[PDB]
């Protein structure tokens, strides 16, 4: 018939061959990421390059097809996803150099060891060690050793590689008819030509700026509280009113403040709801954590997990004999198999991460019936949002008492709510400003507003004015501190997590309203609420077949990301936290630092 039916047949044979090729390439990537060797680097690289070449030739074959013939909007979405000139636009030599840079950075981050001379010989890894050191130690010099070591012995390696990566990705994106590579990352969030549902990328950065500006008060108050507590626990190292050093955040870079809970518990005379001790005293392992996640998903109405998931998942650390990337991940490999890469420890952070990854897997399992090009979540934000909906619904004291892991006689009082909310605020409201600042730096450095050396200066300055976190030792232009993070050195997008927080809070509000939970939202548990699970199932089975705004309004009834549910979560918190800092200076001066005197 006409070219429309020809395009339909094109899509059919594409989806078949692409299913096969994607399964093979995903297998190669998985075997690289769990069994890191050189043979696996070669296998992953050649499989990925072959798949990319096939995708680019199919993309040209689709570029033969004007989109003006489209009646079915789903078909338009599929061809538009196929209409890319793609990252393969670059020259083969240039593409190989870029891939070399990316791989070199990936291995330097995931395997490069710390050998610092401040403790004159000290060599360790990122996994238990540096992370555990920054998470469990309450002494200044040890934290300074860890921080300065990771920054001056690993960032200096990645400074030239990140420079080359920035240049190559920026020019490739300009070849792809984009302003920069941050433009590619933002244009991932595009919605085009759907009856008034359209969404640009400049509107996305404007929305992120607006939401951050609205958030800022709460994070400022939480900052002031945690700084007062640290100065109480660190006598002569946190100077009175200003910021505090970067190694004092219970995390390597200062992304999560949940560990500071141990130091910043508001009411310690109550039973601990951050139950790591309860888990270890209950003889808990990774498998039981994952199985309780499966039980939660069954009880919310979603079907039980696949046997192949149990058989083929890397549910624990493979060991120190092989250096597998231990940053938790969730994988589709196609054809009906699903995997989780979790180096699971017995800790609330790992329990919540396991729930997050199981939500990822359920999201992946629901839309598997869709065609290949739409076999992906409506956004990265939606995947992570589903995962942390599950995580938030788990953490309620009522749920903890449901499995009997929390004592059945445990009493729910005001101080328990304050403890719960302070922990949740530490986590979420410590990620938010850090992610916003980090991707602001990445966006504006890709766009080219910063001279190359000035990179470093600019970076630190913005932290001092956005995250309220400073350095104790000078770092000139020869360092590369941003690359010290996983996502920065693995070509990831970090605003994904900001959208994650906002989306998960809107979804939790709407889903608890659907579940008819009676009471405040922050104790709502959507377990045993099969109809709520059915609604969520509809949303995350929709897939990418419709614009993400449509699924947004399908669940909550909004056309955009909103900050209202998040502030409705931490309202009793905000009250208590304001009540405590009534006699404290909430805020930090930009030119004010224990180092930058």
Numbering used by the authors: 1 to 597
The study reports:
Here we introduce ESI-cryoPrep, a specimen preparation method based on electrospray ionization in native mass spectrometry, designed to alleviate issues associated with protein denaturation or preferred orientation induced by macromolecule adsorption at interfaces. Subsequently, we assessed the efficacy of the ESI-cryoPrep method for high-resolution cryo-EM analysis using five model macromolecules: 70S ribosome, 20S proteasome, apo-ferritin, human angiotensin-converting enzyme 2 (ACE2) and streptavidin encompassing a wide range of molecular weights and biochemical properties. Our findings demonstrate that ESI-cryoPrep effectively confines macromolecules within the middle of the thin layer of amorphous ice, facilitating the preparation of blotting-free vitreous samples.
We acquired cryo-EM micrographs of the specimens and performed image processing for the five types of macromolecule, resulting in 3D reconstructions of the 70S ribosome, 20S proteasome, apo-ferritin, ACE2 and streptavidin at resolutions of 2.7, 2.0, 2.1, 3.3 and 1.9 Å, respectively (top). The estimated B factors of the five specimens were determined as 50, 62, 68, 100 and 52 Å2, respectively. The cryo-EM 3D density maps exhibited sufficient quality for unambiguous atomic modeling (bottom). Notably, in the regions of the highest resolution, fine features such as holes in tyrosine benzene rings and extended signals of side chains of arginine, isoleucine, valine and serine were clearly resolved. The angular orientation heatmaps of the five macromolecule types (70S ribosome with C1 symmetry, 20S proteasome with D7 symmetry, apo-ferritin with O symmetry, ACE2 with C1 symmetry and streptavidin with D2 symmetry) demonstrated that ESI-cryoPrep specimens notably enhanced angular projection coverage and increased sampling rates of Fourier components across most viewing directions. The zx slice of tomograms for the four types of macromolecule prepared by ESI-cryoPrep revealed that particles distributed slightly closer to the graphene side but not attached to the AWI. In ESI-cryoPrep data, the positive z heights of the 70S ribosome, 20S proteasome and ACE2 correspond to the AWIs, while the positive z heights of the apo-ferritin and streptavidin correspond to the GWIs. The same analysis was applied to the ESI-cryoPrep specimens, where the KDE fits of the datasets were characterized by relatively symmetric (Gaussian-like) peaks, with only a small fraction of extreme values (blue).
